[PDB]
């Protein structure tokens, strides 16, 4: 049933990844981000500006241009909460013992 | 403009980087020249080259020796008499005889 | 406000020319000198080496 | 026939000298393309191995 993807079809495979239990957000991995140039560019403005090292080092700053937060964290937040407390007490969830606040976070974050 | 040494085909051909050679030719050259077809060659009789024609060859001839037959043929009907019924012709065309 | 970053970038790229020569030329020096010494190790122990 | 009855030459001449812009638009972006390729050898080039040993640097290597 799944199919092999050959290499010309990959660039699609990337922002239209096929269907998983995990799946990411397919609307949002054009959105993630992680700047490998964002500390060198910094310091070589700093330093074009007339600033020293340590001042350079003192101002440098991380980067905010990052793949954005989860919404869920701050809307769920009472609903996760409880979930972790009943992971933490009941040893992962195991055998079905937090499915309560699951199903409800479920439920809440899909509506049908 | 980002990824040089992978884009060979955006490169300058291996006689620009030689450093040694009225008008003279370029002495800058890219590798995406190959994709144009009148880079290099001329653009001479571009236009010109449709319009040599030559003419068919078939001879509609063939005798008719009727002498030889004594009995009629077939044919064939090619289109429909609409000079008969030419009002109801929409109306029976679908209909088979 | 966007000079002011061009002017930035532009002056980091001149520090940046100035330093890669000042280091290239100390790095060399010592390079050479290194082996200017080697070759004078050397004179002294052909100088002492022995043998036919 | 070419004095009265012949708009062919006409558009053909117009569509040719498209082609010749055209051609030339393409043979500029090339060089220009060319061009970057070798000036990215530019952070590469090193103007001091050029210094011969216990001796000074050129300017006319570029300082």
């Not at chain 2, 040089?4 to 490169?11: H, P, S």
């Not at chain 4, 082609?19 to 970057?36: C, Y």
Request: hydrophobic share 40%; proline share 7%; glycine share 4%.
């Amino acid at each position: 049933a799944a199919s092999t993807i050959p290499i010309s079809q990959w660039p699609s495979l990337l922002y239209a990844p096929p269907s998983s239990p995990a799946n990411p957000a397919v609307e949002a991995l054009p959105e993630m981000q992680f700047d490998d140039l964002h500390y060198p560019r910094q310091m070589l403005l700093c330093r074009g500006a007339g600033y020293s090292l340590e001042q350079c080092n003192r101002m440098a700053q991380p980067d905010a241009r990052v793949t954005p937060e989860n919404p869920a964290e701050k809307l769920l937040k009472e609903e996760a909460v409880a979930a972790i407390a009943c992971l933490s007490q009941r040893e992962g969830g195991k055998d079905e013992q937090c499915r309560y606040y699951i199903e409800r976070m479920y439920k809440l974050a899909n509506k049908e | 403009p980002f990824m040089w040494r992978q884009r060979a085909y955006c490169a300058p051909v291996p006689s620009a980087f030689a450093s040694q050679q009225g008008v003279r030719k370029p002495l800058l050259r890219s590798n995406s020249e190959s994709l144009s077809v009148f880079s290099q060659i001329p653009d001479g009789l571009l236009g010109h080259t449709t319009s040599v024609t030559m003419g068919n060859s078939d001879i509609f001839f063939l005798p008719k020796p009727s002498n030889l037959l004594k009995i009629a043929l077939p044919a064939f009907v090619f289109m429909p008499n609409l000079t008969i019924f030419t009002r109801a012709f929409p109306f029976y065309a679908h209909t088979s005889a | 406000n966007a000079f002011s970053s061009f002017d930035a970038c532009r002056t980091g790229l001149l520090k940046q020319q100035s330093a890669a020569v000042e280091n290239s030329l100390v790095r060399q020096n010592m390079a050479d000198v290194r082996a200017k010494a080697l070759f004078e190790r050397r004179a002294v122990l052909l100088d002492l080496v022995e043998g036919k | 026939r070419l004095t009265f009855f012949d708009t062919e030459s006409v558009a053909l001449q117009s569509r040719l000298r498209y082609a010749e812009k055209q051609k030339l638009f393409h043979q500029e972006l090339d060089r220009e393309l060319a061009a970057g390729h070798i000036a990215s050898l530019v952070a590469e080039y090193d103007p001091v191995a050029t210094r011969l040993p216990f001796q000074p640097m050129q300017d006319r290597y570029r300082v």
